Amino acid sequence: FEALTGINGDLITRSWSASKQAYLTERYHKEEAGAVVIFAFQPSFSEKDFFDPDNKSSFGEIKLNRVQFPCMRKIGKGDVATVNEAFLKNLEAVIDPRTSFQASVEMAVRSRKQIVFTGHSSGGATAILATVWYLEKYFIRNPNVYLEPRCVTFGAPLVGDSIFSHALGREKWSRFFVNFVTRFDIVPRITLARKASVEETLPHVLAQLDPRNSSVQESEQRITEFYTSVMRDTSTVANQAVCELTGSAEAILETLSSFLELSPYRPAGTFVFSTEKRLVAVNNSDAILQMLFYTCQASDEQEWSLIPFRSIRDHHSYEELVQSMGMKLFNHLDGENSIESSLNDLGVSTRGRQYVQAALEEEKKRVENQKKIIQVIQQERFLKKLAWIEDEYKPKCQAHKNGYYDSFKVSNEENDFKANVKRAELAGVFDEVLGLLKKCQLPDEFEGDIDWIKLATRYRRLVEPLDIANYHRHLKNEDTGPYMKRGRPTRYIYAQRGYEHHILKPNGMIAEDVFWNKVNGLNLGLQLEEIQETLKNSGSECGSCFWAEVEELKGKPYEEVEVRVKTLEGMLREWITAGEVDEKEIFLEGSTFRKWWITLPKNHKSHSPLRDYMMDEI
Amino acid sequence: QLQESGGGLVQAGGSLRLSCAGSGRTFSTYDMAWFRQAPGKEREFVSSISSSGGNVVYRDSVKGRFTIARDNAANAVYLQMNSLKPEDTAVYYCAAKWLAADYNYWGQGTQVTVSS
C-alpha cells in the first residue's frame, strides 16, 4: 500500500487524529509533528454547505476561474473544470487572511516542511480543493520534493467533474490524493443525486451524520427515501457512463444527453475502499465511479431494508478502519492479474465486475494508443519528413530570395507540390491524433508529455505557415473568411495551447493575460475595450499565424488597420527569438511581408522598429 | 455578508454614490462588480473592478459617467453615478467573487429611481 500511495499508516493515523481535533477548532486545526505539518479542516453538516442556496444549477456546480486555477481545464479544448460551489466557498472562507491559514502554509513552505491537507466528510473535500489551491499557488511555481503536498480524505463527497480528474491526471497530481471510503458510506454518493431529489430529506440525514448531534431521532422513512433517490440517480449516471465509455450507441446517447440531467461529479484521485477484511486501492476514475454503485448493493433480498442504516453507520466507522489498517488484506485492483476475488469480497455483482473490467480495458487501450503514437513519432520516415522540410526545402527557398511561404503559395516548381504532399500527410496524422484526443481515447497525461509538446511545436512552427499559404492559395479567405476566424485547423490550436500551457504554467499566468498586457504595453493610447474590439480574432496571438495576419493586413488602408500593424510589429522579435518565425525568410526581397511593408507610409517606416533590418526604397 | 447603501430618488443629471461593504476580507482578493436589475429586464452587467488590478471596463451606457472605486482599508466599493438617465431606474447590486467564472456573492441591493 505504501509503495503505491506514497503515504504510510503513521501519516494516515495522524491525519485522522487531526481531522478529529478539527471538530473542536475554528475553521481548521494545525498539527506540527516534527517534519510534518497537518492542516485539518472543520467539517459541516448543514445543507447550505453542500448545496449553496444561491446556486441555481441542478448540482450546486460552478466553473473555476481560469485566472486563479489555470491548470484546472482541458488544454486543447479549453473547457474549464467545474467544482462544488459550497466547497469552493468554504475553501475561500478559510483562505481568508484573518484565519491565518495562508500565513501558516507559507511558514511551512519557507521551512521546507511536509504539508498535509486532511479532513473528514465535507472537510476532506475542502482539503482536496485546498490542495489544488496549493498546487496552483505554490507547487506549480517551483516543484520540489519538499513542496509536494499530500491530500488524505475520509468519506469525502465528490468535488469535481471529468475535466477536473483529467486535468489532475495530465499534471501528474492525482498521485497526491487518497480518499478513504467505507464500503457503504453514503456521503461520497450524495452529490451524485439531483438536488430536487433530496431537498426534503437531506437535512435529516445530515443531522444523523453529524457525530456530535445525537438529538434528532432516527427516522426509517426519511433515510430510506434518501437512499433510494441517491441510488436511482447514481444508477442512471453509471449506466450512461457505461454506454458512453464503450463508444457504442452514440446517437441515442447524444440525444438523451441533450435530454438527460446527470450529475457531473466524478472520482478524482486514488480511492481506497474498505471492508472488514480487505483494502482495495483503485486509480481509474471510471472504475471508481462504477464501484461506488456496484459495491453498495444487497447480497440477499432480505438485506435491502438493512443497507441504508449500514450506509449511515459506516460513516462513523473510520476509527475502526484506522485501527485495523495493518490487519487487513491489501491489493491494487488495476495491477491485479485477476480482479474476481477483490470485487467478490466487495459484494460487486458479476455485471458490475464486467463494467469495472471494461473501464480498465479502456484505459489500457488509451495507453496502447499512446505507445503507438510514440513509436510513430520516433520512426525515421516521420522525422525525415520534417528534416526534409527544414534542411532542404527552406534553404532552397531562401536561396531564391522569396522564402518558402511565398514559394509554396505560388507553387511554381515540383518541390512545392512535394512539400504540399508531406504537409497533407502530416496534417492527416495530427488530425487523427486530435480525433483520438477529442474522444478521450488517450491517457490523461498525453497533453502534458513534453516529447509530444516538443514535436507538435516543431510541427506547428514548420508547417502552419504552409497551411496558411495553402489556405490563401485557393482563395479560401474570400469564400470562407479570415483564416483566424473560420479557417485555422484545430490541430494547430491544440499544439499552440499545449505549448503555451507547458511554458506558462510555472509562472501562474495565462496566455490571454500576457497578450493583453503586451497590447497595453505597446502604448497605443486607445481605450482597452476599443483595442480588444480591433484585435478580435487577430493573427498576432500565435507566431505561426504571422503570415495569416499579413494576408489580413495587406490591401487595407493604413488608418483602418494601424493598430493591428503596430501589434504585428511588436510581436516579431520574440517570435524570431523563440523560433516561431524564421528570420531568414520573412525579410527576403521577394517575401510578401517585405513587399507589403515597403508600401507603408514613409513616416511609419522611419520610426518603425524594423527599419534597421531591411534596406529602404531607393 | 455583503450589504449595500446609498440609494435615493433624484431626477436627471443627479450625482449619487452607492457604497457596498462586507464582513469578510474582500477588497482586492474578490474582484468587485456592479449589476443593475431593472423591473422585468435582465440583470444587465454594469461594470466590474479587477480586484487588485486596475483593469476595469464599463459597458456603453455608462462610460464616463458612473465611476467605480475600491477601498481596501474599508473593504468597500464605491459606485459614482453622475449625469443620471431616467432609464437607469433599477435595483443596484454589488457582486464580488473569485475562484469562479461568474460572480455569486450578492447583497441586498438598493433602489435607484430617476424621473424627468
A54, A57, A105: which is closest to A83 by C-alpha? A57
Half-sphere exposure of A609 (CA within 13 A, CB side): 10
Q: Write phi, then psi, for A496 (nearest 5 degrees).
A: -60, -50
> Which residues in chain B have their CB less than 8 angstroms from residue A63's CB?
100-102
Chains A and B form CB pairs within 8 A to the count of 40
Q: For the packed helices A122-137 and A85-95, what is the interaxial angle rounded to 10 degrees? A: 60
Residue A56 CA: distances (Å) to CA of A193, A264, A321, A384: 15, 15, 38, 55
- Smallest CA-to-CA distance from B113 within B9, B7, B4 is with B9
- The rounded distance, in Å, linking the Cα atoms of A464 and A466 is 5
- Residue appearing with cell numbers 484526443: A437
Residue of B nearest to A136 (CA): B99
Chain A CB contacts of B98 under 8 Å are: 65, 67-68, 92
Q: Could you tell me how many residues make up chain A? A: 618
Q: CA angle, A162 as apex, A156 and A168 as ends, to 5°?
A: 75
Taking the C-alpha atoms of residue B92 and residue A65, their distance in angstroms, rounded to an integer, is 24
Rounded-to-integer distance, Cα A402 and Cα A469, Å: 13
Q: Which three cell numbers stand for residue A424?
A: 497533407
Residue A351 Cα distances to A239, A263, A294, A355, B12, angstroms: 11, 22, 9, 6, 71
**Separation CA A356–CA A354 (nearest Å):** 5
Nearest CA in chain B to A528: B57
- Contact check, Cβ <8 Å, B99/A92: yes
For A196, how many CA atoms within 13 A lie in the half-sphere containing its CB?
Answer: 5
Q: With contacts defined as CB-CB under 8 Å, which chain A residues touch B99?
A: 64-65, 68-69, 88, 91-92
Please give the Cα distance from A396 to A391 (Å, whole number).
9
| Closest among A429, A489, A504, A518 to A73, alpha carbons compared | A504
What value, to the nearest 5°, has the Cα angle with vertex A527 and ends A523 and A528? 80
Q: Is A93 in CB contact (< 8 Å) with chain B?
A: yes
- Burial class of residue B46 (count of CB atoms within 10 Å of its CB; 0-12, 13-18, 19+): buried
Residue B105 lies in domain:
1-116
Distance CA(A264)–CA(A241), nearest Å, equals 11
- The angstrom resolution of this structure is 3.7
Q: Which of A88, A94, A89, A119 minimizes the C-alpha distance to A19? A: A119
Residues of B in contact with A71 (CB under 8 A): none
Which residues have a Cβ under 8 Å from the Cβ of A162 and sit 6 or more positions away?
A: A264, A266, A285
In this complex, do B99 and A64 lie within 8 Å of one another by their Cβ atoms? yes
- What is the helix (H) or strand (E) element at residue B44, kind and residue range? strand B43-48
Separation CA A57–CA A53 (nearest Å): 10
Task: Enumerate the residues of chain B whose CB falls inside 8 A of the CB of residue A55.
Answer: 104
What is the total count of domains within chain B? 1
> What would the grid cell of residue A81 be?
473544470
CB atoms within 10 A of CB A56: 8
Cα distance between residue A447 and residue A113, in whole Å:
31
Of residues A65, A96, A97, nearest to B99 (C-beta): A65
| Burial degree of B92 (CB within 10 A; 0-12, 13-18, 19+) | buried
Which residues, other chains included, contact A615 with Cβ-Cβ below 8 Å and sequence gap of 6+?
Answer: none
Rg, C-alpha atoms of chain B: 13
- For A129, the closest chain B residue by CA position comes to B99
Are A64 and B101 an interchain contact pair (Cβ–Cβ within 8 Å)?
yes
Which of B31, B93, B99 has the highest number of chain A CBs within 10 A, making it the mutation to test binding with A? Answer: B99
| DSSP notation for A396-412 | HHHHTTSHHHHHHHH--
Residue with cell 494547430: A492
Q: Which of A256, A605, A13 is nearest to A614 (CA)?
A: A605
Q: How far apart are CA A76 and CA A497, in angstroms?
A: 6
With CB atoms and an 8 Å threshold, state whether B24 touches A63.
no
Residue B41 to residues A56, A216, B37, B94, Cα–Cα distance (Å): 19, 45, 7, 17
Can you say how many angstroms the Cα of residue B54 is from the centroid of all Cα atoms in its chain? 16
Kindly report the CA angle at A173 between A167 and A174, in degrees rounded to 5?
85
CA–CA separation, A146 and A109 (whole Å): 8
Concatenated DSSP letters for A40-89?
EE----SGGGTS-TT--STT-EEEBPTTT-TTSB-TTT-PBPEEEHHHHH
CB atoms within 10 A of CB A249: 11
CA A378, distance to chain mean position in Å, is 27
DSSP state of A584: T
Task: Give the dihedral of Cα atoms A303, A304, A307, A309; nearest 10 deg.
Answer: -100
CB B18 within 8 A of CB B5: yes
User: What is the residue whose three cell numbers read 483593469?
Assistant: B55
Q: What residue has cell string 433510494?
A: A228
CB-nearest to A93 from B24, B57, B104 is: B24
Using the beta-carbon criterion (under 8 Å), do B55 and A528 form an inter-chain contact? yes
Q: Is A450 exposed, middle or buried (0-12, 13-18, 19+ CB in 10 A)?
A: exposed
A605 CB neighbour count, 10 Å cutoff: 16
DSSP state for residue B43 in the 8-state scheme = E
* Closest in B24, B99, B106 to A54, CB measured: B106
Contacts of A68 in chain B (CB under 8 A): 98-99
What's the CA gap between A82 and A166, in Å, rounded? 12
Catalytic (active-site) positions of A: 121, 185, 315
Cell 495587406 identifies what position? A554
Q: Which helix (H) or strand (E) holds A182?
A: strand A177-182
Write the DSSP symbol of residue A156: P
Contact A73, A169 (CB under 8 A): no
